[PDB]
């Protein structure tokens, strides 16, 4: 369930929710700025049109080239039900709220006006302690809601009743992701689990859009403070200040650049040795997931990337891609000079170790043998292929294997075929 982008969530929306979600304060601005470079023009054009137009016009207004992108963007906006063909008339609520959004249409005593660096530092701090709890740290910040949240997010599982929760296959993969992507998956799971737990996604999600620029919102907002995404000096203040992370929100690494705008620290040697100029134990814990740590200094740690530690990581669920990415995104300024930044021998070795771990591909299936004829065999094979139930075939050897579920269908068909007698 690697929901790497907003588009997957956008498809997970029905008209009965889209219409309410299409509020005037933030959704229109957030949605419009997220639409493709093409559709944004047409939506803005028809913002003053009360009468639909034929698809041929939109089609002829684009060259033969880029027509696929226009079709794809048309598929999205039609999938978003932003307009109706009625033959592309915008939805009245969407048009009206977009119109009001252009101009708009609340105040009180001054706040503590805490410095933006301070806000982003404790936000990063808050996310770090969340990850410190996520990793196998002997001590970390905890909270019943935080724990169950990470658990319902599929990141952690409790092996025994009363024992501390441990990390799942997805959790290990998640831990290595970059902060924005890592935060994104968390936000997405919170949103999904919110509607699941009865929190109105409409209001909280619209609120997330507003932060990027009721009791349900207050409860939700309290969690956002606990996530460090918003600052509130005291629980009594009716006003809050969104942190950089909350402002970024669903902008992704494309907005204001990736998290790579940070000091690099991992050095990778051709002898699989790692030197990470770091004091933050979270980085150490992550490095320990796939490398054998040797020595720790006040500002640096020495480790080695072995078959044991890597194949252990792969066995736990990690991939060489995530490892190579984790290193590359953290590579120290000194090794940035060489190209590629990581030594090819290292990258190739890591990939080759994971590829060894899956030398054998295991697949459940049911095998039929001793087909009395090539005709009925190929006939049954064609049916298995028509059903997409086929797993593997060797017509020369007159054999095929099918998925156990699909097998019941060929079992039924085989019996039907045999019962024709």
């Amino acid at each position: 369930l690697q929901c790497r982008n907003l588009q997957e969530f956008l498809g997970g929306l029905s008209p009965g929710v889209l219409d309410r979600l299409y509020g005037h304060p933030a959704t229109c601005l957030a949605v419009f700025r997220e639409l493709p470079s093409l559709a944004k023009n047409w939506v803005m054009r028809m913002l003053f049109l009360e009468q639909p137009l034929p698809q041929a016009a939109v089609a002829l207004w684009v060259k033969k080239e880029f027509s696929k992108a226009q079709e794809e963007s048309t598929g999205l906006l039609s999938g978003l039900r932003i307009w109706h063909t009625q033959l592309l008339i915008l939805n009245p609520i969407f048009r009206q709220n977009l119109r009001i959004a252009l101009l708009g249409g609340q105040l009180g005593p001054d706040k503590h006006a805490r410095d933006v660096p301070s806000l982003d530092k404790y936000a990063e701090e808050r996310w770090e302690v969340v990850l410190h709890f996520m990793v196998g740290s002997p001590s970390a910040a905890v909270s019943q809601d935080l724990a169950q949240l990470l658990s319902q997010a599929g990141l952690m599982k409790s092996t025994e009743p009363g024992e501390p929760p441990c990390i799942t296959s997805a959790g290990f993969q998640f831990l290595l992701l970059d902060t924005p992507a890592q935060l994104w998956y968390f936000m997405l799971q919170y949103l999904q689990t919110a509607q699941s737990r009865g929190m109105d996604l409409v209001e909280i999600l619209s609120f997330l859009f507003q932060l990027s620029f009721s009791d349900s919102l207050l409860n939700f907002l309290q969690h956002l403070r606990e996530f460090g995404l918003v600052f509130q000096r005291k629980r009594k203040s009716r006003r809050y200040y969104p942190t950089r992370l909350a402002i970024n929100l669903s902008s992704g690494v494309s907005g204001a650049g990736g998290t790579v705008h940070q000091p690099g620290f991992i050095v990778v040697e051709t002898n699989y040795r790692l030197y990470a100029y770091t004091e933050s134990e979270l980085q150490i814990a992550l490095i320990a997931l796939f490398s054998e740590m040797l020595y720790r200094f006040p500002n640096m740690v020495v480790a080695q990337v072995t078959r044991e530690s890597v194949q252990q990581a792969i066995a736990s669920g990690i991939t060489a891609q995530q490892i190579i990415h984790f290193l590359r995104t953290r590579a120290h300024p000194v090794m940035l000079k060489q190209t590629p930044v990581l030594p090819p021998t290292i990258t190739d070795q890591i990939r080759l170790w994971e590829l060894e771990r899956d030398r054998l591909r295991f697949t459940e299936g049911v095998l039929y043998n001793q087909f009395l004829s090539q005709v009925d065999f190929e006939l049954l094979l064609a049916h298995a292929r028509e059903l997409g139930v086929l797993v593997f075939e060797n017509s020369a050897k007159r054999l095929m294997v099918v998925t156990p579920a699909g097998h019941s269908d060929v079992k039924r068909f085989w019996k039907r075929q045999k019962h024709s007698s």
Partner: peptide, 15 residues
């Protein structure tokens, strides 16, 4: 002339 072969130019591992 005498350029490196392909197997020494790029990663031969499927990745």
């Amino acid at each position: 002339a005498k350029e490196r072969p392909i197997w020494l130019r790029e990663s031969t591992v499927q990745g």
